[PDB]
Design a protein around this ligand. Structure first.
Ligand code: DO3
Ligand code: DO3
Ligand code: CL
Ligand code: CL
Ligand code: CL
Ligand code: CO
Ligand code: CO
Ligand code: CO
Ligand code: GD
Ligand code: GD
Ligand code: GD
Ligand code: GD
Ligand code: GD
Ligand code: GD
Ligand code: GD
Ligand code: GD
Ligand code: GD
Ligand code: GD
Ligand code: GD
Ligand code: ZN
Ligand code: ZN
Ligand code: ZN
Lengths: 337, 337, 337
């Protein structure tokens, strides 16, 4: 079962990389304070929630930062110029609405388009916030350094599928949190991390990893799903279950284990071939300290890093189940390759 | 004064070129039936509302059709392919939501984007409606020929400025209708037309023009407003008043008259230099039958033909006033150049 | 006040990345041994100077390595081929003098130009050291691995502005050093680090960060200043004060504090929008161990990484004042974002 209302709330709560404290951080803390033995916030802004247990020591990470924008200029006529935080594609900004977090509250701006008869790149991205002068714009609360996000826009397309900005990674943050709320008996000593600044170099998990010092590390990010024009170069598909990579970033014995957990609980599990260190928190967890046994558990989505990221609710539900089952079944074990 | 609620309603009511009967037509008829002597709908779908009077015979036209999309393909996996109705730019479709009018009601779809590592044109525009098969998509109500529009999204940015799809031409349809509701005493014999199929060749006004046979014809469309990257090649500016073109499509004595009406009522009036026959209903009105004395009265907007068209409410209000004043002050006159 | 003689000396002292021991290290050790409680040199060459105090533990880093050149070949005719250590532009080498540190003392070389009628790249970079044969060059003290720098050339242009190779980062090393010298009572437990190998991966601040384990970290590097042909994309300006970034790498609470310090001491303070993890020592400090509260304090300069790096003495003076003031005002406080 999926809680649509809570999911929507977690997806749309403010928090670009480096600015997770604008909303999502407190929302996450307020949900986990009730179920975790202890909840802390570190100097980088990570939310670390301890679910006390015996062994092994297990870290789970789902990043709460969104890709977004920073204002770096305001011109005489009151237009804004912006620059990306994280892998924003400028092509997805044309004729779109941007949600800004100014000092007088949330405001909106609009990225225009040039009518054909007066005619891809970041210098063409000029934000219109409804002002006539630099002074009016400043008075609205706009500053050099003001942060913006894709305007919220949640759409259920069918019974199962839905499109919204920022499924990466709010969809896995939601699944991770949900699995934690339902967490039953477990031998493992579990740390649930809502990591910070993942979209700009995995920095949150790097630092939380150092603090916690786990034996097992599991990252919950989204992954690419088969979509139009992918040239058939994408293995996972929407609606066919959660995904767990295989490859160098993936500890073989941990990956084997998760497979059998899935078999026992009869949860469909997809394979994603990953020949490189992943672009997830598992990358830096694996090379933390003396080494960590790591894996990636992901929800497949279409249209990664756009206002229109699309998932299947059956994959979300199954991801919650497998996350829960894994955390409960995890026991001391030989992870040596 | 501007009625934000009514404006929003008129802007968002369904009606692409050739399909104004999906909503906007009845909305317009229902508003004008109360104030007009007689309201008719012609074979092309035009709404013609007569406000009886003496002379001259005056036609006013604001088009109620929107640019939009038609589905022309549904593939095995349930994706849609679409083609434009009117001057839709494909660049404005990336990561956008489309509102569809299917046979089982309104549904939504989403135009994806291709993640960078697997890489402007219409064959790249594939619509995702949350289906898995052609059959599921058909069952949803999708057909070859299903119509779609930009998803509604009204945003007031500041006290005066607001951005939304389809200000062209719902913003002038609203101003025109509003002026008609407030219409006082007038010597002129007035026909208020909500024209059809303007974005694909001015066809509605061509035909309504023939039926009515006016001596004076006035078109209310939107026009380009000064915006970023316009190379300073746009004269009108947001917030500096309604616009009335000057040029070959504009009868000199009618244009003179409107100028003095504006002076008397002290409504700011901008000039737009138009050396060609205009891309408005005034084009075909002027060459109707034995000739018609024509002018263009427009509201300036930024970002023409995108989801993010932007206007200034002060221009809207002033447009209502000048439209009203002109209709009341209009009297028999020598229009001979 | 700025000490021109001391500033010049610190700027022109030898020390390319990995070879900071050729001069700058001892000059730094010699100056701070007089004011610091303790001075150590680590395995990579960082100079770490302890200024005892209570809390918080504060690391300040100004890098003492310069970008430079390494000889990787000597041909039969005694010419050298070189390769860059750090972000050297080959364009800045045409018709320039190079200072080399040979086994027989400092020597000079020249990178030529080809007269046009005989006609951008590293293969066009051939150094002429005045030799006729490989042996003569060898006998002169030149080896594969010989290190070279931009020849020193300090010039005061006006009362406040001056241009020289290697303001990056000797100008902030100088500022940090002066601030330490003038340091009064302070609650913070202060470590002044003159770091090693910054222009090639922030190595050194990475290791010093680890040994010191601070709670607060401040980098003093140079930053870009508004200059000709910058497309107006550079916010900070010469003469308008020190600069402090805002963005993910900058702890919001520390940044707010520093702002407050500036206001109280009436020191002009600029903002630089930095949406990425910075290209300064603060990048690795932030992700050191369990995380650090970090900021960047920088001097604005023109023509970064060239022989004519150019600064304003008023910004230097103010950077010292702000550096001093910050270190004295710093106290325990909650840095949680
Ligand atoms: N599964 C193991 C035991 N299951 C219990 C369980 O599902 O954990 C018993 C009941 N099971 C109900 C069901 O799962 O639909 C029916 C038989 N199953 C077939 C199937 O997998 O559907 C065979 C093996
Ligand atoms: N306008 C014609 C007559 N107006 C009446 C009217 O505005 O139709 C008289 C009152 N008018 C009030 C006002 O308009 O603000 C003040 C004087 N106006 C100045 C102005 O235009 O502002 C001078 C000429
Ligand atoms: Cl990721
Ligand atoms: Cl038009
Ligand atoms: Cl640097
Ligand atoms: Co991402
Ligand atoms: Co149009
Ligand atoms: Co540098
Ligand atoms: Gd550019
Ligand atoms: Gd104010
Ligand atoms: Gd079963
Ligand atoms: Gd250890
Ligand atoms: Gd094509
Ligand atoms: Gd059916
Ligand atoms: Gd007046
Ligand atoms: Gd006639
Ligand atoms: Gd080469
Ligand atoms: Gd002086
Ligand atoms: Gd520690
Ligand atoms: Zn992610
Ligand atoms: Zn139009
Ligand atoms: Zn530097």
């Amino acid at each position: 079962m999926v809680d649509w209302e809570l999911m929507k709330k977690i997806i749309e709560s403010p928090g670009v990389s480096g600015y997770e404290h604008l909303g999502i951080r407190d929302l996450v803390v307020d949900i986990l304070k009730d179920v975790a033995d202890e909840v802390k916030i570190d100097k980088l802004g990570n939310v670390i929630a301890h679910f006390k247990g015996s062994a092994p020591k297990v870290m789970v990470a789902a990043h709460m930062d969104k890709i977004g924008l920073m204002v770096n200029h305001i011109d005489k006529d009151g237009y804004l110029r912006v620059v990306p935080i994280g892998g924003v594609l400028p092509e997805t900004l044309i004729a779109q609405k941007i949600r800004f977090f100014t000092e007088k509250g949330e405001r909106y701006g609009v990225v225009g388009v040039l009518p054909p008869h007066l005619r891809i790149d970041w210098d063409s991205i000029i934000v219109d916030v409804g002002a006539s002068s630099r002074e009016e714009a400043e008075e609205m609360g706009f500053r050099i350094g003001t942060i913006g996000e894709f305007a919220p826009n949640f759409t259920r397309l069918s019974e199962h599928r839905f499109a919204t900005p920022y499924l990466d990674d709010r969809i896995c943050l939601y699944a991770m949190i949900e699995a934690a709320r339902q967490l039953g008996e477990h031998e493992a000593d579990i740390y649930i991390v809502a990591s910070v600044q993942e979209e700009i170099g995995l920095r949150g998990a790097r630092v939380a990893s150092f603090a916690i010092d786990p034996e097992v590390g599991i990252a919950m990010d989204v992954t690419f799903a088969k979509q139009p024009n992918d040239k058939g170069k994408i293995v996972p598909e929407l609606g066919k279950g959660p995904v767990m990579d295989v490859g160098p970033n993936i500890n073989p014995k941990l990956r084997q284990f998760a497979d059998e957990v899935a078999k026992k609980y009869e949860i469909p599990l997809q394979v994603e071939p990953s020949p490189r260190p992943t672009g997830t928190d598992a990358n830096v967890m694996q090379i933390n300290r003396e080494g960590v046994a790591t894996a990636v558990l992901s929800i497949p989505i279409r249209y990664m890093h756009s206002q229109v990221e699309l998932a299947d609710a059956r994959d979300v539900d199954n991801t919650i189940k497998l996350a829960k089952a894994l955390l409960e079944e995890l026991k001391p074990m030989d992870f040596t390759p």
